[PDB]
Amino acid sequence: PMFIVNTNVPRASVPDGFLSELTQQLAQATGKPPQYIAVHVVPDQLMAFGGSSEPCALCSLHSIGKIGGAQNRSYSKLLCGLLAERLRISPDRVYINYYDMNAANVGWNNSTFA
Amino acid sequence: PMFIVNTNVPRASVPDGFLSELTQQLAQATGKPPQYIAVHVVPDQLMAFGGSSEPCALCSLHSIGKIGGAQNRSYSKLLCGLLAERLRISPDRVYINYYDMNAANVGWNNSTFA
Amino acid sequence: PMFIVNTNVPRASVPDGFLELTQQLAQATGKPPQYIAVHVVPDQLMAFGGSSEPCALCSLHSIGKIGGAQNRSYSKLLCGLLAERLRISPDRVYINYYDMNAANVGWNNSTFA
Ligand SMILES: *C(=O)c1ccccc1
Ligand SMILES: *C(=O)c1ccccc1
Numbered sequence: 001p002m003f004i005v006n007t008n009v010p011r012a013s014v015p016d017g018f019l020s021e022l023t024q025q026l027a028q029a030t031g032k033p034p035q036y037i038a039v040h041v042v043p044d045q046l047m048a049f050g051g052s053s054e055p056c057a058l059c060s061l062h063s064i065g066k067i068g069g070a071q072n073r074s075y076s077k078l079l080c081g082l083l084a085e086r087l088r089i090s091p092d093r094v095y096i097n098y099y100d101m102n103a104a105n106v107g108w109n110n111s112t113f114a
Numbered sequence: 115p116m117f118i119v120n121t122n123v124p125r126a127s128v129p130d131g132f133l134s135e136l137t138q139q140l141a142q143a144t145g146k147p148p149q150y151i152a153v154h155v156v157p158d159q160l161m162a163f164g165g166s167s168e169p170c171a172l173c174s175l176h177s178i179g180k181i182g183g184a185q186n187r188s189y190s191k192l193l194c195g196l197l198a199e200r201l202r203i204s205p206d207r208v209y210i211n212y213y214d215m216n217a218a219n220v221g222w223n224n225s226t227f228a
Numbered sequence: 229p230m231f232i233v234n235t236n237v238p239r240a241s242v243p244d245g246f247l248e249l250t251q252q253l254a255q256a257t258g259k260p261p262q263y264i265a266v267h268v269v270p271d272q273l274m275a276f277g278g279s280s281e282p283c284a285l286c287s288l289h290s291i292g293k294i295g296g297a298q299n300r301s302y303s304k305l306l307c308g309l310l311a312e313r314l315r316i317s318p319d320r321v322y323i324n325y326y327d328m329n330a331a332n333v334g335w336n337n338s339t340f341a
């Protein structure tokens with residue numbers, strides 16, 4: 001799995017330990033070993049949400065399975081929770097796109113997961 | 115709906131009001147209220163299009179519906195038009211990937227749109 | 229086709245000539261290089277398996293030319309380039325492949341449909 005957050009929150013407002021926290025919480029949530037979890041935070045972005053430049057985030061979570069109705073609500077509560085606590089972003093200013101990838105469409109270590 | 119543009123155009127060449135113009139024009143084009151629209155511009159990128167580093171843009175539009183043949187042609191004319199006028203990017207050096215997201219696969223405000 | 233690589237490798241470690249990717253993608257996909265778009269994003273705040281050693285998160289979008297065997301080939305190619313040029317271990321690279329419908333790719337005021 002792999003989680004990306006793009007935000008207008010400045011770099012200095014991202015707490016040390018954030019990428020580790022996301023890695024551990026995502027490992028717990030998805031039931032996958034942390035060794036497979038990739039996380040990426042992109043601060044200082046030029047963005048707007050509803051026409052406002054108040055803190056916001058545009059995120060993605062890609063997984064091979066483990067994507068679906070109830071699971072995605074649970075991930076949203078988790079990830080919005082983290083972004084609110086750690087980056088002070090309102091949950092109503094967060095979008096998270098969820099992608100259920102086919103194993104043949106994820107490359108890794110010179111091959112794919114197929 | 116949500117629109118992202120990555121470009122090699124420098125930040126100083128992004129005019130004031132650009133995010134807001136995107137927001138307003140996307141609201142007009144998609145019909146959706148502006149308060150839902152997210153926009154994101156990433157200048158100063160290291161990119162090439164057809165092997166050349168002349169101004170170019172790689173973009174995405176995600177929407178829950180309101181994606182299809184004619185709609186996407188209309189969006190492309192709109193967006194290419196804005197990029198040409200405001201960032202001086204030739205339309206033939208713009209790619210826009212369109213994504214029709216399932217509501218269950220879009221997180222927002224501690225829950226999804228399903 | 230379009231290829232995007234996001235990496236914590238610093239900008240100074242991306243060698244001259246790298247945006248090589250265009251040529252090699254043209255060759256791999258059997259498409260003219262005029263169609264190929266490439267984007268490299270260095271200096272990123274990222275981890276892979278909880279480590280901040282060099283890593284990359286990438287995407288390849290194509291209108292067709294995506295599938296089992298093809299994607300393995302693309303991955304050997306691309307991981308090879310990332311290892312040689314950016315000193316990223318192949319097991320610290322993910323590449324998401326997307327088979328786009330022509331109607332869902334915009335270009336030159338219209339789409340490819
Ligand atoms: C996680 O293992 C994963 C899933 C999809 C893309 C990348 C990583
Ligand atoms: C807009 O409401 C929207 C649609 C799809 C993904 C993100 C935002």
Ligand SMILES: *C(=O)c1ccccc1
Binds near residue numbers: 209211263264265328
């Ligand atoms: C290649 O021509 C291509 C570029 C953008 C999206 C899909 C394919």
